[PDB]
A paper describes a structure:
We selected KKKKKK as the positively charged intrinsically disordered peptide, a sequence found as a disordered region in proteins36−38 like KRas. We selected EYEYEY as the main negatively charged peptide for interacting with KKKKKK due to its presence in human proteins, such as MAP3K5, albeit without an experimentally verified ordered structure. Improved filament separation at pH 10 allowed for detailed imaging, showing a homogeneous, single type of cross-β filament with a diameter of ∼50 Å. Testing all possible indexed symmetries established that the nanofiber has C2 symmetry, with a helical rise of 4.68 Å and a twist of −4.22°, featuring parallel cross-β packing and six hydrophobic pyrene rings in the core. The nanofiber’s asymmetric subunit (ASU) contains three peptide copies: one Pyn-KKKKKK (1), one Pyn-EYEYEY (2), and a third with only an ordered pyrene ring. The remaining residues of the third peptide were flexible and disordered, revealing a disorder-to-order continuum and demonstrating unexpected conformational heterogeneity in heterotypic intrinsically disordered peptide nanofibers. Moreover, analysis of the atomic model revealed multiple hydrogen bonds between tyrosine and lysine, and we have seen side-chain densities from the cryo-EM map to support those side-chain conformations. K1 forms three intermolecular hydrogen bonds with Y2 and Y4 from the same peptide and Y2 from another peptide, and tyrosine also forms an intramolecular hydrogen bond between Y2 and Y4. The conformationally disordered Pyn-EYEYEY and Y6 from the ordered Pyn-EYEYEY should allow hydrogen bonding with additional Pyn-KKKKKK, which explains the postassembly bundle formation. To verify this, we also synthesized Pyn-EFEFEF to interact with Pyn-KKKKKK and found that postassembly addition of Pyn-KKKKKK was unable to form well-defined bundles.
Author numbering:
A (entry chain B), B (entry chain C), C (entry chain C), D (entry chain C), E (entry chain C), F (entry chain C), ...: 1 to 7
The structure:
């Protein structure tokens, strides 16, 4: 598996 | 493989 | 593979 | 593969 | 593959 | 493949 | 492929 | 393919 | 393909 | 293709 | 194709 | 094609 | 095509 | 095409 | 085409 | 075309 | 075309 | 065309 | 066309 | 066309 | 056309 | 056209 | 046209 | 046209 | 036209 | 036209 | 036209 | 026209 | 026209 | 026309 | 016309 | 016309 | 015309 | 005309 | 005319 | 006319 | 006319 | 006329 | 006329 | 006229 | 006239 | 006239 | 006239 | 006239 | 006249 | 006249 | 006249 | 006249 | 006359 | 006358 | 006358 | 006358 | 006358 | 006358 | 006368 | 006368 | 006368 | 496996 | 596998 | 696999 | 697989 | 697979 | 596969 | 596959 | 496949 | 495939 | 395929 | 295919 | 195909 | 194909 | 094809 | 094709 | 094709 | 084709 | 074609 | 073609 | 063609 | 063609 | 052609 | 052609 | 052509 | 042509 | 042509 | 042409 | 032409 | 032409 | 032409 | 022409 | 022409 | 022409 | 022309 | 012319 | 012319 | 012319 | 012319 | 013319 | 013329 | 003329 | 003329 | 003329 | 003339 | 003339 | 004339 | 004349 | 004349 | 004349 | 004349 | 004348 | 004348 | 004348 | 004358 | 004358 | 392998 | 292997 | 496995 | 192996 | 396994 | 192996 | 395993 | 295992 | 005348 | 005348 | 005348 | 005349 | 005439 | 005439 | 005439 | 005439 | 005429 | 005429 | 005429 | 005529 | 005529 | 015519 | 015519 | 015519 | 015619 | 016619 | 016609 | 016609 | 026609 | 026709 | 027709 | 027709 | 027709 | 027709 | 028809 | 038809 | 038809 | 038809 | 038809 | 139709 | 139709 | 139709 | 249709 | 249609 | 349609 | 359609 | 359509 | 459509 | 469509 | 569509 | 579409 | 679409 | 689409 | 699409 | 798409 | 897509 | 996609 | 995708 | 993807 | 992806 | 990915 | 990925 | 990845 | 990764 | 990674 | 990694 | 890593 | 690492 | 004468 | 005468 | 005468 | 005459 | 005459 | 005559 | 005559 | 005549 | 005549 | 005649 | 005649 | 005639 | 005639 | 005639 | 005739 | 005739 | 005729 | 006729 | 006829 | 016829 | 016829 | 016829 | 016829 | 017829 | 017929 | 027919 | 027919 | 028919 | 028919 | 028919 | 029919 | 039909 | 039909 | 039909 | 139909 | 239909 | 239909 | 349909 | 349809 | 449809 | 449809 | 559809 | 559809 | 659809 | 669709 | 769709 | 779709 | 889709 | 999709 | 997708 | 996707 | 994806 | 993804 | 991903 | 990922 | 990842 | 990762 | 990682 | 890591 | 790490 571009 | 959620 | 939700 | 929801 | 909902 | 709902 | 509903 | 409803 | 309802 | 109802 | 009802 | 009812 | 009823 | 009833 | 009834 | 009844 | 009854 | 009855 | 009865 | 009875 | 009976 | 009976 | 009986 | 009987 | 009987 | 019998 | 019998 | 018998 | 018998 | 018999 | 017999 | 017999 | 016999 | 016999 | 015999 | 015999 | 014999 | 014989 | 014989 | 013989 | 013989 | 012989 | 002989 | 002979 | 001979 | 001879 | 001879 | 000879 | 000779 | 000779 | 000679 | 000679 | 000679 | 000579 | 000579 | 000579 | 001479 | 572009 | 562009 | 453009 | 353009 | 343009 | 333009 | 323009 | 313009 | 313009 | 303009 | 203008 | 203008 | 103007 | 103006 | 103006 | 003006 | 004005 | 004005 | 004015 | 004014 | 005024 | 005024 | 006034 | 006034 | 006044 | 007044 | 007054 | 008054 | 008064 | 009064 | 009063 | 009173 | 009173 | 009273 | 009273 | 009373 | 009373 | 009483 | 009483 | 009583 | 009583 | 009583 | 009683 | 009683 | 009683 | 009693 | 009794 | 009794 | 009794 | 009795 | 009895 | 008895 | 008896 | 008896 | 008896 | 949440 | 959360 | 790009 | 959180 | 790019 | 948090 | 790029 | 790049 | 001197 | 001187 | 001198 | 001198 | 001198 | 001198 | 000298 | 000299 | 000299 | 000299 | 000399 | 010389 | 010389 | 010489 | 010489 | 010579 | 010579 | 010579 | 010679 | 010679 | 010779 | 010779 | 010879 | 010879 | 010979 | 010979 | 021979 | 022979 | 022979 | 023979 | 023979 | 034979 | 034989 | 035989 | 036989 | 036989 | 037989 | 038989 | 038989 | 039979 | 039979 | 039978 | 039968 | 039967 | 039957 | 039957 | 049946 | 049946 | 049936 | 059936 | 059925 | 069925 | 079914 | 089914 | 099913 | 099923 | 199933 | 299942 | 299952 | 399961 | 009384 | 009384 | 009384 | 009374 | 009274 | 009274 | 009274 | 009174 | 009164 | 009164 | 009064 | 009064 | 008055 | 008055 | 007045 | 007045 | 006045 | 006035 | 005035 | 005036 | 004036 | 004036 | 004026 | 003026 | 003027 | 002027 | 002027 | 002018 | 001018 | 000018 | 000018 | 000019 | 000019 | 010029 | 020029 | 020029 | 030029 | 030039 | 040139 | 040139 | 050139 | 050149 | 050249 | 050249 | 060359 | 060359 | 050459 | 050559 | 050569 | 040669 | 040769 | 040769 | 030869 | 030969 | 030969 | 031969 | 032969 | 042969 | 043969 | 043969 992911990319989690939180904010 | 696999991308496993067991939610 | 697979993309597994078991929801 | 497959894109598996088991909902 | 396949795009599997089992709803 | 296929686009499978089993609804 | 195919676009399968089994409704 | 085909566009399959099995309704 | 074909556009298949099996109604 | 064909446009198939089996009604 | 053809436009098939089997009614 | 043809426009087929089988009625 | 043809415009076929089989009535 | 032709305009076919088979009546 | 022709305009065919087979009556 | 022709205008055919087969009556 | 012709205007055909076969009566 | 002709105007044909076959009577 | 002609105006044909075959009577 | 002609006006034909064949009587 | 002519006015033909064949009687 | 002529006025023909063949009688 | 002429006025023909063939009698 | 003429007025013809052939009698 | 003439007035013809052929009698 | 003339007035013809052929008798 | 003339008044003709051929008798 | 004349008044003709041919007798 | 004349008044003719040919007798 | 004249009054003719040819007798 | 004259009054003619040819006798 | 005259009154003619040719006898 | 005259009164003629030719006898 | 005259009263003529030619006898 | 005269009263003529030619006898 | 006169009263003529030519005898 | 006169009363004529030519005899 | 006169009363004429020419005899 | 006169009473004439020419004899 | 007179009473004439020419004899 | 007179009573004439010419004899 | 007179009573005439010319004899 | 008179009573005339010319003899 | 008179009673005339010319003799 | 008179009673005339001329003799 | 008179009774006349001229002799 | 008179009774006349001229002799 | 009278009774006349002229002799 | 009278009774006349002229002699 | 009288009874007349002229002699 | 009288009885007349003239002699 | 009288009885007349003239002699 | 009388009885007359004139001599 | 009388009985007359004139001599 | 009388009986008359005139001589 | 009388008986008359005149001589 | 009487018996008359006149001489 | 995913991208999760939360906010 | 997915993209989940939440917000 | 998907895109899920929620909001 | 899909696009799900929710809102 | 689809587009689902919900709202 | 489809477009589903719900609302 | 289709378009489904619901609402 | 179709268009389904429901509402 | 069709158009289905329901409502 | 058709158009189905229901309502 | 047809048009079906129902209602 | 046809037009079917039902109602 | 036809027009069918039912109702 | 025809027109069928039923009702 | 025909026109059929039923009713 | 014909016109058929039934009713 | 004809016109058939039935009824 | 004819006109057939039945009824 | 003819007119047939039946009834 | 003719007119046939039956009835 | 003729007119046939039957009945 | 003729007129036929039958009946 | 003639008129035929039968009956 | 003639008139035929039968009956 | 003639008139034929039969009967 | 003539008139024929038969009967 | 003549009149024929038969019967 | 003549009149023929037969019978 | 003549009159013929036969019978 | 003459009259012929036969019989 | 003459009259002929035969019989 | 003459009269002929035969018989 | 004359009268001929034959018989 | 004359009278001829034959017989 | 004359009278001829033959016989 | 004369009278001729033959016989 | 004369009278001729022959015989 | 004269009388001739022959015989 | 004269009388001639021959014989 | 004269009387001639021949014989 | 005269009387001539010949014979 | 005269009397002539010949013979 | 005169009397002439010849013979 | 005179009397002439010849012979 | 005179009397002449010749012979 | 006179009397002449010749012979 | 006179009397002349010749011979 | 006179009497002349010649011979 | 006188009497003349010649010879 | 006188009497003249010559010879 | 006188009497003259010559010789 | 006188009497004259010459010789 | 007187009497004259010459010689 | 007197008497004159000459010689 | 007297008597005159000359010689 | 796998990417395991057990959530 | 694996990436294990047990959450 | 992941990337977690928090902030 | 594995990457184990037990959280 | 991960990268955790916190801040 | 493993990377063990027990958290 | 990890990288933890805190700050 | 790790890298912990704190600060 | 005489003298008759009566009275 | 006489003399008759009556009275 | 006479003399008759009556009275 | 006579003399008759009556009175 | 006579003399009759009456009165 | 006579003399009758009446009165 | 006569003399009658009446008055 | 006569003499009658009346008056 | 006569003499009648009346008056 | 006569003499009648009336007046 | 006569003499009648009236007046 | 006569003489009548009236006036 | 006569003589009548009236006036 | 006569003589009548009126006036 | 006569003579009538009126005036 | 006559003579009438009026005027 | 006559003579009438009027004027 | 006559003579009438008027004027 | 006559003669009428008017003027 | 006559003669009328007017003028 | 006559002669009328007017003018 | 006549003659009319006007002018 | 006549003759009319006008002018 | 006549003759009219005008001018 | 006539003749009219105008001019 | 006539003749009209104008000019 | 006539003849019109104009000019 | 006539003839019109103009010019 | 006529003839018109113009010119 | 006529004939018109113009020119 | 006629004939028009122009020129 | 006619004939028009122009030129 | 006619004929037009131009030229 | 006609015929137009131009040229 | 006609015929146009140009040239 | 016609015929146009150009050239 | 016509026929156009150009050339 | 026509026929155009060009050339 | 026509026929165009060019060349 | 036509036929174009070029060449 | 046509037929084009080029060449 | 046509037929083009080139060459 | 056509047929193009080139060559 | 066509057929192109090249060569 | 076509058929291209090249060669 | 076509068929290309090359060679 | 086509068929290409090369060779 | 095609079929390419090369060779 | 195609089929390529090479050889 | 294709099929390539080489050889 | 393809099938390559080489050989 | 392919199938390669070599040999 | 492929299948390679070599040999 | 492949399958390689060599031999 | 592969399968290599050598032999 | 592979499977290598050698032999 | 592999499996190597040698033999 | 491998498995090596030799033999 | 390996497994080596030799034999 | 290994396992070596020799034999 | 003599003076004869026969008383 | 003499003076004779026969008393 | 003589002076004869027969008283 | 003589002077005869027969009284 | 003589002077005869028969009284 | 004579002077005869028969009284 | 004679002087005859028959009184 | 004679001088006859019958009174 | 004679001088006859019958009174 | 004679001088006859019958009075 | 004679001079006859019958008075 | 004779001179007859019947008065 | 005779001179007859019947008065 | 005769000279007859009947008066 | 005769000269008859009936007056 | 005769000269008859009936007056 | 005769000369008859009926006056 | 006769010369008849009825006046 | 006769010369009849009825006047 | 006769010469009849009815005047 | 006759010459009839009715005047 | 006759020559009739009705004038 | 007759020559009738009704004038 | 007759020659009728009604004038 | 007749020659009728109604003038 | 007749020659009728109604003038 | 007839020759009718109504003029 | 007839020759009718209505002029 | 008839020859009718209405002029 | 008829030959009608309405001129 | 008829030959109608309405001119 | 008819030959109608309306000119 | 008819031959109608409306000119 | 008819032959109509409207010219 | 008809032959209509509207010219 | 008709043959219509509108020219 | 019709043969319409609108020219 | 019709044969329409609009030229 | 129709045969329309718009030229 | 129609055969339309718009030329 | 139609056969449309727009040329 | 139609056969459209736009040329 | 249509057969469209736009040329 | 249509058969479109845009050439 | 259509068969489109854009050439 | 369509069959598109853009050539 | 379409069959597109862009050539 | 489409069958696209871009050639 | 499409079948794209870019050639 | 598409079947892309870029050739 | 696509089937891409870049050749 | 795609099936990419870059050849 | 893709199936990439770079060949 | 991809299936990469770089060949 | 990928399946990489670099060959 | 990848499956790398570098061959 | 990767499966690396470097061969 | 990787599975490295360096072969 | 890695599995390293260096072979 | 690694599993190192250096073979």
């Amino acid at each position: 598996x992911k990319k989690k571009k939180k904010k | 493989x696999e991308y496993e959620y067991e939610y």
